[PDB]
Each structure stands twice: as structure tokens, then as C-alpha cells.
From a paper:
First, we were interested in the interaction of a VRAC channel with an inhibitory sybody and hence determined the structure of the LRRC8A/Sb1 complex. The data is of high quality and allowed reconstruction of a map that extends to 3.1 Å for the entire complex and 2.7 Å for the pore domain. In contrast to the apo protein, where the LRR domains were mobile and thus poorly defined in the cryo-EM density of the threefold symmetric channel conformation, in the LRRC8A/Sb1 complex these domains and their interacting sybodies are much better resolved. In this substructure, the sybodies bind to the convex outside of the horseshoe-shaped domain. They target an epitope located on repeats 8–11 and bury 1420 Å2 of the combined molecular surface. As intended by the design of the concave sybody library, the interface encompasses residues from β-strands 3, 4, 5 and 8 on the flat face of the binder involving residues from all three CDRs. On the LRR domain, the residues buried in the interface are predominantly hydrophilic, whereas on the sybody they are dominated by aromatic sidechains. In addition, the LRRC8A/Sb1 complex also reveals the conformation of the C-terminal part of a mobile loop connecting the cytosolic helices CLH1 and CLH2 on the r-subunit, which was poorly defined in the apo structure. Sybody Sb1 binds towards the C-terminus and stabilizes the threefold symmetric channel conformation observed in the apo protein. Collectively, our results demonstrate that the presence of Sb1 in the cytoplasm of HEK cells prevents activation of VRAC channels by interacting with their LRR domains.
Numbering used by the authors:
A (entry chain L): 1 to 114
B (entry chain F): 216 to 254
C (entry chain F): 356 to 808
D (entry chain E): 558 to 608
E (entry chain E): 406 to 507
């Protein structure tokens, strides 16, 4: 009965900052790897970032390295995706993925950058 | 000393001896063992 | 006699044999000394050495020579009183294996073994002389040391400055003096392959120090838990890392800092979740990745990001399903999934155009997808111990198929299209004889003729 | 590099030093062999090309 | 006994060629230098490995074409004639020693 739903997306200029929220209900956020994925229109889905289940070990894609950030809060059970130095290339729909017994995908927030 | 504690041992010479005389010496060792045990 | 000439292996004589010796001594001590040698044990062992030299003639040793898996000429000596002096007359000898050979001195005659590269000291403490030591220092490439005791490790092995491959077999750690016998590993300036099977509870510091030039580190704790604890992110020249039976139960984060690694093995680590493989995208040349013999319950979809993989091993696990993202690695060439709870193969399995070996032995595969036969270069298959109801007729599409295992399935008849494989022979068709009887007689004759030729 | 070798190198053509991994220090003891035509520093553990 | 053990025929058959297109004879672990090795004037390189207490005989003058002498773990005591011959007929000398005194 795990629900993954995103919020905080929208349309923003390039070179700014944007923040995403992934709401987790049925599982503790800090105990499972949280993966951010993007799918550009007319393109296969591309991984964005991940957080380890321990040690706050974070992973980022090569094309987005040093620009995006990932964080989570167990008290409120959410995953934060902070997007910085945005470009028209990073225009894609973002999903927060988990695996608690099975595969779970979020609703997806539309992100467009001028 | 460094040489003694590092498994390095001194040279020892060797030779070649007849097979027949070697078998004779082996049998003589066995016989001396048996005789010492008996005596 | 023995206090002067140093032959202490003559025990004192008891009754009725010391009396006659005393009489002889009164007559002539010369007979006493001519008898003492024959009663000594050092003399008996030396005569045994001479008899060994005479018995193991060069022809006998050459007939005893075999070739190990690495196509090297091998001589394995087991339970001999010493090294025969004639084992150094075979110039073609490549590997010298010594097991359970006592009171052994490496003679200077070992310098005749120009082609000697590997020395296996199995439970054998051997002393060496300066000429032989210098020869081995200039020539010996690999050393296998198996020891039940620290003192059984020869202490001259740290002076072999051309050694490249050192295999330490046996428990080495001790209380209050641990990791001190291997303090001499720093002097091995050309070491590349270091294998540690010693039940280490913590990686020794000297291993980290010498690992800056190591190219392969292999550890086998045979059940002992190994704690890396930030001692592994300095061996940047490493290219193969094997952690067998380390009881990790978790992938340490130190592995992903080895930017030159290519082959990582994590066998018998009791792994449960392998979602750490997301960090493997840092390793930009990771080709072979063995995760076999674990408790892995699922393959994370993040395994698709490892587009440079070529060999993937996940057998002997608790995998129940195959994700579709696993088939994003189009460079994959080996996908061994034997002994799992798989029940079907996703249709994307045909996307891996370069797959060559695919073993799904001991699963619940009742039927194979027709897309599976798009992998035209699939040289070998292993579909044994499954529940395959019927073999698809498209098996003949795989022209390069050479060895296909089929024993243990619920098959009734073999397809006639199985015989159209140009290279498949009766040797390569591993199947029950009852099933094999179902082939057409032309197919049987062709398979037998191919097996003959 | 010994001083005696530096002295004798005034007439040398080829020099080969093989230390078997042990570090060797040149320290301005090599420029006197201006006749040298083939210099080999094998396993000298230089860690950097000397000037 | 050595000449009985290592005759001229056995030595000449034992003669081999190295990679340098040089005719060389390898003497390894012998009691001494057989006196019959010097009747082969074709030699150019001589290898004395692990031969104890060798004295360089004056017969080395017979080896006109000898250019290289290899002394591996074999310290050589020399005489005036042999030393004078080597001072004008030796071009390459290979010395491998386990100790300074060697």
C-alpha cells in the first residue's frame, strides 16, 4: 500500500533553482534507496539521482553531475530533488522510484525549462 | 645476523652412488635395526 | 664421536648391545665408529635421499610430468622425504609443486630450472642457499604458500624481488603480533596478484601499502567476516577484486572508488540487496561482475545503467524474476542465472544480440520465448533441470549453437529442427537417451558422424 | 650513484642500472657522462624523471 | 676424473649458441675446470657458474678467440700469464656474486 507521488514541478527559466517533493506513505524513506528518473519526450527514460539506505551516499548522472541534489526526511517521509543551473535539455518528466517488495513508480511531475 | 634469520643456509656438497650399493646399504640399515631390537 | 663430528642422531644403547660395543672399543674404536654411522638416523635419511635420486630417474620424472590448466608443465611432489636432486635436470619444468616434504633445503642446482616460474610450498618449510636464493630472486614469478603455522612460511620469500603473484593460504592473524610476518611484503616491489585466504578479521595495513601497484586482490575468509573499514580506496591500480566467503552481507562502498576495476567477484558474501550497484556507474570499465552464491532476492532495475557490462553472473541466488531493464546492457555476453526460482524469460532477452552463453539450469522455465532465438550467436545453452514442456521449433535458427544441455526437463519429443544446427554434435547435445531416441535417424547419424569428426 | 662510477663515466657509452625496485638517487651525479649514448634506468624507482 | 667425466667430444656436443651469434660453453656445478675445454679454440664466451676454488690455468692462452668470461658465483684466482693474456684478450666480463669477497 505504498504511494509515490511527486510535487513541486513546473516551468522555470534556465540557470535558476527548482525543488521537487516525493511523498512516501507506506515505507520509511530513510530505509530504502530512492531513485529519481527523467524521461525526455521522444526519448527513453533517464536516471537522475539516488540516495543510499545508509551513510547518505548519493549518486548522480554524468550529464547532471554537480547540478542536482537529492535529500530526504524521515520525520515527514518525503524525498527532495533540488534542481539547479537548469537548461532546456533537462526538460523531462521526473519520477521517484522505489522497490519495496515490488516495483513502485511515482505520478510524475512535468518539468519544462526555457 | 641477517643471513641466519632469513632462511639462508650454508652450502653442502653431494655425490652420486651406485644403485646396487644403495640397496645393499638400505638392507643393511634394516638388518641393523632388526638386530638392535633383538639384542 | 657425535660431539666432535656432529651426528647427534645416535641414541644411547641398552643392555647386551653396549657390552659388545665396549669389548669392540677395547679392541679398536674404529669398529665403533664404523658401526655408529650405520646405527645413526641422519645417515639413514641421507641414504634415503640417495636412493630417491636413483629411483626417480629423469625418464621417471618426465613420465610423471603433467600439464596444469594453464598449459604449463607441472611436477607435483607429494609425501617424499625430500626434493630429489634430479628434479632440477628437467629444463622444461615450469611449475614445482611441493606438498608435505620435510627437512627440505633448496639446493643451488635449482638454477638449472631456467623455465621455472611457479613454486608451490604446500605445508613445506624449506631453507634455501645463497645461489639458489639469488636465482629465485631473479627468476621466480609466482609463489604458493600454504601453511598451518606462521613459522612454516620461509622468511626468504620477501627477498624475491621479481615476484609478481603471491598466494597466502592459511590463518596468519595472531594476538598482539598480528600482521607482522607480512611486514616484509613491502619489499616485494613487483607484486601484482595477492591472494589472501587467511580468515582476516580486518585487512592488514601492509596489504593496503603494497596495493598501490597490485592489479588483483583475492580474499577468501572461508566464513570469517571481513571489515574493510576504509582501507581499500588507495589501490587505484587494481583491476580485479575478489571477496569470496567474506560474509559481507553488504557491498562496501570502498569498491566503487577503484576507478580501474574491471572484474569484481562477491561470491558467498550472503548478499541480500544488491542495490549498491547503482554506484558501479563510476567504474567506467567494469566488464565482468560476479554476484553468484548469495541470497540475492531481486535484480534491481538500476543494473541497466551498467551499459559496459559483458559478463554477468547471478546464479545460486533467490532471484524470482528478471527485470526488463536488465536487457538494456546490449554488450552482455554471459548471463548465467542457474539455480534460481525463475519461471519465465522476458521477451527483451532477444535484444542482447551478443549473448553467447545463457544458463538457466534449475529453474521453473516451462517454455522459452520465441524472441529468445533472435540471439543468433548463442554458442551454448543450458536448459537442464527445468520444467520445459516443449522445445520451440526455432532452435535451429541459432546457427552457432554448439553445446545445449537438456537433461532434467519434462520433454516428450525433441524437435526435428534441433538437428539443423551446423555445429551441434552429439557431444554438444546433453540430453536423456529416451529423449534422444526421438530424433529422426538422419539426425542421429549426422550427430554421430560429427562427434566422430 | 657512486662517485667512482661518476669518475669512470668520462669514457663510457652505455650505462645500465637495475636496482630491482630499490630507489636510486642521481643528485647531479650523472651529467659528467657526456659521452653516454644509451642510458638505462631499469627498476630504479625514480617516481619522476630526473633533470 | 674430470677429463674422464667431460671429454672433448661431450663438451663439443654440449656447445651451444646464445642469442648473440656467439659460441659459448656453460660450466655449471663442476669440481673444477676440465683441462679439455681449452682444446676448443672455437669458443668466444666462457661461463663458469658454481665451480669452487677455481684457478685460471695458463692454458687459457689456447683460447685465442675468447672474448667474454662469465664468473657466476665463482671467484677466480689468477696467475701472471693468465692475467697478462686477459689484459689483452678480454673484452666483456660478467660478474655475479653473492658477497663482496667473491
Amino acid at each position: 500500500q505504498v504511494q509515490l507521488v511527486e510535487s513541486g514541478g513546473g516551468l522555470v527559466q534556465a540557470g535558476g533553482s527548482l525543488r521537487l517533493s516525493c511523498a512516501a506513505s507506506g515505507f520509511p524513506v530513510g530505509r530504502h534507496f530512492m531513485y529519481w528518473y527523467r524521461q525526455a519526450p521522444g526519448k527513453e527514460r533517464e536516471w537522475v539521482a539516488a540516495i543510499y539506505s545508509y551513510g547518505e551516499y548519493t549518486e548522480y548522472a554524468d550529464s547532471v553531475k554537480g547540478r542536482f541534489t537529492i535529500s530526504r526526511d524521515n520525520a515527514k517521509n518525503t524525498v527532495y530533488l533540488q534542481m539547479n543551473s537548469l537548461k532546456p535539455e533537462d526538460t523531462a518528466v521526473y519520477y521517484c522510484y522505489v522497490y519495496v517488495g515490488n516495483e513502485y513508480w511515482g505520478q510524475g511531475t512535468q518539468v519544462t525549462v526555457s | 645476523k641477517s643471513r641466519i634469520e632469513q632462511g639462508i643456509v650454508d652450502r653442502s656438497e653431494t655425490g652420486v652412488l651406485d644403485k646396487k650399493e644403495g640397496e645393499q646399504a638400505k638392507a643393511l640399515f634394516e638388518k641393523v635395526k632388526k638386530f638392535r631390537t633383538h639384542v | 664421536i657425535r660431539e666432535e663430528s656432529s651426528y647427534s642422531d645416535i641414541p644411547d644403547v641398552k643392555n647386551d648391545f653396549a657390552f659388545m660395543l665396549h669389548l669392540i672399543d677395547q679392541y679398536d674404536p674404529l669398529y665403533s665408529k664404523r658401526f655408529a654411522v650405520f646405527l645413526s638416523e641422519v645417515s639413514e635419511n641421507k641414504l634415503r635421499q640417495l636412493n630417491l635420486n636413483n629411483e626417480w630417474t629423469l625418464d621417471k620424472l618426465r613420465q610423471r610430468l603433467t600439464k596444469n590448466a594453464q598449459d604449463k608443465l607441472e611436477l607435483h611432489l607429494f609425501m617424499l622425504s625430500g626434493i630429489p636432486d634430479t628434479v632440477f635436470d628437467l629444463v622444461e619444468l615450469e611449475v614445482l609443486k611441493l606438498e608435505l616434504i620435510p627437512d627440505v633445503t633448496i639446493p643451488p642446482s635449482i638454477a638449472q630450472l631456467t623455465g621455472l616460474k611457479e613454486l608451490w610450498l604446500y605445508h613445506t618449510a624449506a631453507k634455501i642457499e645463497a645461489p639458489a636464493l639469488a636465482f629465485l630472486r631473479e627468476n621466480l614469478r609466482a609463489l604458493h604458500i600454504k601453511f598451518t603455522d606462521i613459522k612454516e612460511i620461509p622468511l626468504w620469500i620477501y627477498s624475491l624481488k621479481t615476484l609478481e603473484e603471491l598466494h597466502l593460504t592459511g590463518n596468519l592473524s595472531a594476538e598482539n603480533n598480528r600482521y607482522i610476518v607480512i611486514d616484509g611484503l613491502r619489499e616485494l616491489k613487483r607484486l601484482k596478484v595477492l591472494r589472501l585466504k587467511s580468515n582476516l578479521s580486518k585487512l592488514p595495513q601492509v596489504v593496503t601499502d603494497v596495493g598501490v601497484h597490485l592489479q588483483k586482490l583475492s580474499i577468501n575468509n572461508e566464513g570469517t567476516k571481513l571489515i574493510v573499514l576504509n582501507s581499500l580506496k588507495k589501490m587505484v591500480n587494481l583491476t580485479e577484486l575478489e571477496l569470496i566467503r567474506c560474509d559481507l552481507e553488504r557491498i562496501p562502498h570502498s569498491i566503487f572508488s577503484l576507478h580501474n576495476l574491471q572484474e569484481i567477484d562477491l561470491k558467498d558474501n550472503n548478499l541480500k540487496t544488491i542495490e549498491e550497484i547503482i554506484s558501479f556507474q563510476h567504474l567506467h570499465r567494469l566488464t565482468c561482475l560476479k554476484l553468484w552464491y548469495n541470497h540475492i532476492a531481486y535484480i534491481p532495475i538500476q543494473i541497466g545503467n551498467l551499459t559496459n557490462l559483458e559478463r554477468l553472473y547471478l546464479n545460486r541466488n533467490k532471484i524470482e524474476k528478471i527485470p526488463t531493464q536488465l536487457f538494456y546492457c546490449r554488450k552482455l555476453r554471459y548471463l548465467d542465472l542457474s539455480h534460481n526460482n525463475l519461471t519465465f524469460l522476458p521477451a527483451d532477452i532477444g535484444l542482447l544480440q551478443n549473448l553467447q552463453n545463457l544458463a538457466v539450469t534449475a529453474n521453473r522455465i516451462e517454455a522459452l520465448p520465441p524472441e529468445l532465438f533472435q540471439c543468433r550467436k548463442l554458442r551454448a545453452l543450458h536448459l537442464g533441470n527445468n520444467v520445459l514442456q516443449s522445445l520451440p521449433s526455432r532452435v535451429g535458427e541459432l546457427t552457432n549453437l554448439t553445446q545445449i544441455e537438456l537433461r532434467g526437463n519434462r520433454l516428450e519429443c525433441l524437435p526435428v529442427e534441433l538437428g539443423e544446427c551446423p555445429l551441434l554434435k552429439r557431444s554438444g547435445l546433453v540430453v536423456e537417451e529416451d529423449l534422444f531416441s526421438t530424433l529422426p535417424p538422419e539426425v542421429k547419424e549426422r550427430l554421430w558422424r560429427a562427434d566422430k569428426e
